[PDB]
Amino acid sequence: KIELSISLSLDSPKLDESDFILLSVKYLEKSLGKKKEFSGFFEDIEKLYFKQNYKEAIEKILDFCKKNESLLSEQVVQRLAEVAPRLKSNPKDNESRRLYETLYADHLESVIKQESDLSVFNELRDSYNAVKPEYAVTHETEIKTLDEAKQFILSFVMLNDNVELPLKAQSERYPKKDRSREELGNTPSANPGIMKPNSPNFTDNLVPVRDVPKIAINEKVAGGYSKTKPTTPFVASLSGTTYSLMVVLTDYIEKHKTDKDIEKKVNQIINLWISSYIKEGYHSYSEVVDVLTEPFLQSIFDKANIKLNYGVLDDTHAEFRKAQDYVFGLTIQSAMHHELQERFKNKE
């Protein structure tokens, strides 16, 4: 039933680029079957997806199918080709991505659970307690459980707007942030992570109701992150609190320049920070990554030999599959919601 279930989904008007990718590979996964003749494909597509190289995957997807059109169905393939040139992603409505990313945070956070002896965080304490502005509070208790650690890494927000500024001055990307200053107020949501409060989610992934804040896009900013990266879910446009992490991290690096295991370690703090920011709702992936990736910041790492994974992980399939079904259903529903309504406009 995939041949039609998919075409029905393609019909959806609000199809993002993230979706075609997710849906297509599904048709291709199911129909082609698991023959390792093509397993190289799905693995790149699920890796490029994470890295937001959507167009590339799209090309590869279309041509994978061009070559294997005998095996597959032209009807889906042709459609995939008609809808593709026009696909676009609106940041404020990249719902599938917000599911992939909320869930990836957990995988990533679960990775660090096993990977870390929570040593680095008990040693980053000293660097924070030093660069802390006086108004802040020292951390003097042992960071033993990893939930204690999140609290710590998230208290680097206290250093903001004081110590963050010298490092922020050099960004050529931050000046393009689009959080509008309208203090539209907090709203409730029972949806996890970067997910939007009024958007569907699997009934298993529903955090208890909380008051998530609501933020807005200036949209008059030119070159705004949101317009440059329309492929990004927008919770606040960009983390300047990253710059505050980097104040601390620059210090850890200097203070522990010698240590052999520095690379691994810096990537437990950089990476947890990513998890927790996408988890607790503060920002998306590309809103933290795309500030740390800026050249000026990399010099700190490069000159101390730290190559950063940025949280790229070996397997993202779990979250690919789950997201595939999200779009599947969110999209077959749309179609139902249009037949339902062509049957109520066909009455009286």
Partner 1 sequence: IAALVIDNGSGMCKAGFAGDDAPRAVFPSIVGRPRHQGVMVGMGQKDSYVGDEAQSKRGILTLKYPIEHGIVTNWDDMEKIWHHTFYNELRVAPEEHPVLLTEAPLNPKANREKMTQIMFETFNTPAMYVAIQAVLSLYASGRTTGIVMDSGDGVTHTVPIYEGYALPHAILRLDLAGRDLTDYLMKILTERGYSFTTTAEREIVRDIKEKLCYVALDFEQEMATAASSSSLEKSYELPDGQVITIGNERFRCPEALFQPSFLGMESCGIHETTFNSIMKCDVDIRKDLYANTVLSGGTTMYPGIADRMQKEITALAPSTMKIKIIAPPERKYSVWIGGSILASLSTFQQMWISKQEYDESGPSIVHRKCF
Partner 2 sequence: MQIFVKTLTGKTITLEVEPSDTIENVKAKIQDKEGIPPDQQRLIFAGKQLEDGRTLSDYNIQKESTLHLVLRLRGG
Q: Which residues lie near partner 1 (CB under 8 A)?
A: 1, 4-5, 8, 33, 74-75, 78, 184, 187-190, 197-204, 206, 209, 214, 322, 325, 329-330, 332-333, 335-337, 339-341, 343-346
Q: Which CB atom, from 31 or from 162, has the smaller least distance to partner 2?
A: 162
Identify the residue among 79, 107, 179, 255 touching partner 2 (CB under 8 A): 179
Residue 343 contact, options partner 1, partner 2, none, Cβ 5-8 Å cut-off depending on partner type: partner 1
Beta strands 210-212; 187-189: pairing state:
antiparallel
In whole angstroms, what is the distance from residue 93 CA to residue 235 CA?
11
Decide: 61 and 80 in contact? Cβ < 8 Å: yes
81 lines the binding site for partner 2 (CB under 8 A): no
Nearer to partner 2, 220 or 343 (CB): 220
Among 7, 122, 160, 205, binds partner 2 (CB under 8 A): 160
Q: Which helix (H) or strand (E) holds 10?
A: helix 2-10
Neighbouring residues of 183: CB distance < 8 A, sequence distance ≥ 6: none
The CA distance from 122 to 145, in Å, is 11
- Tokens, residue 319: 């979250």
Task: Report the alpha-carbon angle 254-257-259, nearest 5.
Answer: 145
Residue 325 binding result from partner 2, partner 1, none, given CB thresholds of 5 to 8 Å by partner type: partner 1
Q: State how far the Cα of 60 lies from the Cα of 334, in Å rounded to an integer.
A: 27
Q: Which is nearer to partner 2, 134 or 342 (CB)?
A: 134
C-beta of 60 vs 210, nearer to partner 1: 210
Q: What is d(CA 16, CA 326) in angstroms, rounded to the nearest whole number?
A: 13
Kindly state the smallest distance separating residue 320's Cβ from partner 1, in Å.
Answer: 14
Binding site for partner 2 (CB under 8 A): 134-137, 158, 160-162, 165, 174-177, 179, 181, 183, 221
